[PDB]
Amino acid sequence: MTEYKLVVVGAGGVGKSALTIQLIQNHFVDEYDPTIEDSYRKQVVIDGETCLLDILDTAGQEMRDQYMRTGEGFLCVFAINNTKSFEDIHQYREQIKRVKDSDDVPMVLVGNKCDLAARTVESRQAQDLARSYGIPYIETSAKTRQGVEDAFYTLVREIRQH
Numbered sequence: 467m468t469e470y471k472l473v474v475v476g477a478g479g480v481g482k483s484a485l486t487i488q489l490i491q492n493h494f495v496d497e498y499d500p501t502i503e504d505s506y507r508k509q510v511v512i513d514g515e516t517c518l519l520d521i522l523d524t525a526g527q528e529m530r531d532q533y534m535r536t537g538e539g540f541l542c543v544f545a546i547n548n549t550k551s552f553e554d555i556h557q558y559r560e561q562i563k564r565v566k567d568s569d570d571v572p573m574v575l576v577g578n579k580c581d582l583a584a585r586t587v588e589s590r591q592a593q594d595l596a597r598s599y600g601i602p603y604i605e606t607s608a609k610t611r612q613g614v615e616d617a618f619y620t621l622v623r624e625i626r627q628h
């Protein structure tokens with residue numbers, strides 16, 4: 467079956483693992499557990515297509531290039547309550563394009579932790595940034611599961627159109 471190699475990247479503590487585990491295990495992890503490198507494989511049916519999602523969950527701690535190279539699509543995540551994680555987004559995108567030798571790689575910008583009230587990053591500025599990159603923007607919450615499937619499925623569809 468079709469296998470989609472997805473890579474989750476972004477600053478430390480934005481919720482990369484929480485989003486992935488919510489998608490794979492149906493539960494919100496409210497634990498301090500920094501990631502070094504973890505991979506998840508799950509069979510799923512998306513729009514009638516039986517496929518295998520091979521997800522690489524990466525570390526936020528500044529081996530990256532190696533895994534970005536094989537990745538077919540990327541979820542670039544930041545937290546809506548951490549301005550620094552939003553700014554860092556640019557550095558991650560630039561590194562992905564340099565490693566993939568392309569100006570256009572399947573990508574989705576993910577604004578996580580939208581269940582929080584203390585927002586420092588307006589949805590407008592994130593949407594504007596996404597528009598300039600030419601990629602979709604989706605707000606998620608690993609806690610309420612809001613937008614979780616949306617983020618991953620949209621990335622798969624982006625890969626299908628590339």
Ligand SMILES: Nc1nc2c(ncn2[C@@H]2O[C@H](COP(=O)(O)OP(=O)(O)NP(=O)(O)O)[C@@H](O)[C@H]2O)c(=O)[nH]1
Nearest residue numbers: 478479480481482483484496501526579607608609
């Ligand atoms: N309220 C709320 N907390 C979240 C959300 N996603 C993650 N968190 C919390 O944020 C903290 C860090 O999440 P985690 O998934 O470990 O982040 P990471 O980006 O994977 N960290 P690392 O890069 O070190 O591997 C945890 O306490 C987790 O519960 C969310 O949508 N809402």
Ligand SMILES: [Mg+2]
Nearest residue numbers: 482483500501
């Ligand atoms: Mg993690």
